[PDB]
Design a protein around this ligand. Structure first.
Ligand SMILES: [Mn+2]
Ligand SMILES: [Mn+2]
Ligand SMILES: [Mn+2]
Ligand SMILES: [Mn+2]
Lengths: 198, 198, 198, 198
């Protein structure tokens, strides 16, 4: 059984960068929808699985990738932002970003171009490639999860579905991305990094 | 070479159903963007094609499908709404629908479910299957147009991208749907029906 | 637990149209691979499901659609051909084909164009659309099943992966399709039809 | 406008590794087909483009990606084999591979697994990531070319479509793979390495 995680800050804690109204609808409407449908779908699936019914298992796959992915991605998302975040990573995480993108700024330009560039709904991700020992940016469509579709471990992700910025920045998806770099909980992406290194 | 069509009604005209601020953004910002990037892609494709560069041509296909399909689809969408819209179609279109669906209500139910059901960004479409001579409800992702990708002739489309409803309906995509029926310009839909029995 | 079905005729029973060597490799090498990997994958999945692990369930989806689909499709395939088949359907099935494609011959041209037309590996299908009460041809990529991806009930399908004709017809995929119409067990596609009508 | 390149060796030359009958079919029938349908599509696209017909352009994209990518990919493939092939690369390419993979053996293992692992028709590719300056193993489906779809520069490709091995290896795609190492023309691969550090 899956549950909606509690938000770790209040809904208006990230104003002026992302405001309360967006935070509230994102969490308790959208994310709530995903874990409920995830729970329904996993249940239908199990029953299909027991009957040995392969047509049903395959029929169910799009709902399980959409709702399972939504739940995963929004859950990493909420911990990736903090009332008290922004600035630059430190330690090993920042030297991996220098090692792989040249510098933090060339890292920002590249994750801003990938997120801005998604055609339709999607997410931009900073991920860890454990097969190669290095950081990598990937973009994903719809709610498709970074690890399950790609194999990379998600460290920082940015929602660019229009429900994530539209009441506030309207169509200006670059203004949302300039705003977002101000609330990034670098302390959490460092920890995400650190568990791969384990 | 491609021009943003003029909306055939003032922005404020489909109130209270679709509000004036969505109509201005959707037309002047969302559709205007598609036309302009389509123009730039067609031109680059022309050069790529001139030179026999198959890599460049393959690399420009997403851009050309996204923006060209975006321009097709919003232009049909604007002719599908009217201040004088709503109600029911009469004559040969209503007969067509009744054979194919049973009742306008079943039709309406089947296309609302096809619209509300899209995952991520996309469109639901009432189309005509020329080979079979029959009406068909398709759904397309992102901006992929009906004819170019399915071969169905576009009769009626309803955009369900979040930018089409969010400022007014927020996440309640069914409330948007129920309201859009009130401005559907059945005159234009039947012209299109008339034209592929042409 | 899934098992390789027994072939209902000997491996050379369909010469000269499809020969023994192809039949043997298709059944006991290729189809055998699919049900074994289906059995491994369903098992991994169940265990992922129990742990509530969504990333693993999604990771497993391509192997479950590929191997589950392979098993389904090849299993319908073997019953679709007979040493003693060919000719034309009778009864209701033939009047549905007249009703939907105009005639049996216009039915053959259309399922031959769809199978010939698949780009890469795939299958052409004659299917039943239970939502609309009519027959429909669909083409599918790789081993994606007709009912699980599309919702149509499979009645007659044609494998056009190259392992299905290459040792015999080489690249001339039209020669394989002319040959195949001679071994089609129409008595079985009638029965498949009849269970939808139930 | 596009021409089938002449094979740089006689058909019989990669015996016993790849036999003479596969080399004749693959070149004169499989690749010759791609070139010719590419020519016909480029021309129709030209007309579609001349007229500002975005539907026609979108409808011709599969054909143009299938056939153009098919022509790209087989042409690089023929320069990748040699009668005088096999063994190991030496010099700067072998250094590159060793940094990126560890040993030629790990490289060979990782690309064989990426090749044997494709589902359906496709290709495995050793590529260069220009932005990162590093070697990458990609796999592509059907005929989608590396650069046009991933941006990686194509260094070494191995076709794993069934027509590339079936007449000689039947379903044992690993035996094909193990043998193809014996004709890889590492001279041509390194020219390509040399050229995007150009
Ligand atoms: Mn979201
Ligand atoms: Mn729109
Ligand atoms: Mn097969
Ligand atoms: Mn080939």
């Amino acid at each position: 059984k899956h549950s909606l995680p509690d938000l770790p800050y209040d809904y208006g804690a990230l104003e002026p960068h992302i405001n309360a109204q967006i935070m509230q609808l994102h969490h308790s409407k959208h994310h709530a929808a995903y874990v409920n449908n995830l729970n329904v779908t996993e249940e239908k699936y199990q029953e299909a699985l027991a009957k040995g019914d392969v047509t049903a298992q395959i029929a169910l796959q799009p709902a399980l990738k959409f709702n399972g992915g939504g739940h995963i991605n929004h859950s990493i998302f909420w911990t990736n932002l903090s009332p008290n975040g922004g600035g630059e990573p430190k330690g090993e995480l920042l030297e991996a970003i220098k090692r792989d993108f040249g510098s933090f700024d060339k890292f920002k330009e590249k994750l801003t171009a990938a997120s801005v560039g998604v055609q339709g709904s999607g997410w931009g991700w900073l991920g860890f490639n454990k097969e190669r020992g290095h950081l990598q940016i990937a973009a994903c469509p719809n709610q498709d999860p970074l690890q399950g579709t790609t194999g990379l471990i998600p460290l920082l992700g940015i929602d660019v579905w229009e429900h994530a910025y539209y009441l506030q920045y309207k169509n200006v998806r670059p203004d949302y991305l300039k705003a977002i770099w101000n609330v990034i909980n670098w302390e959490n992406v460092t920890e995400r990094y650190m568990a791969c290194k384990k």
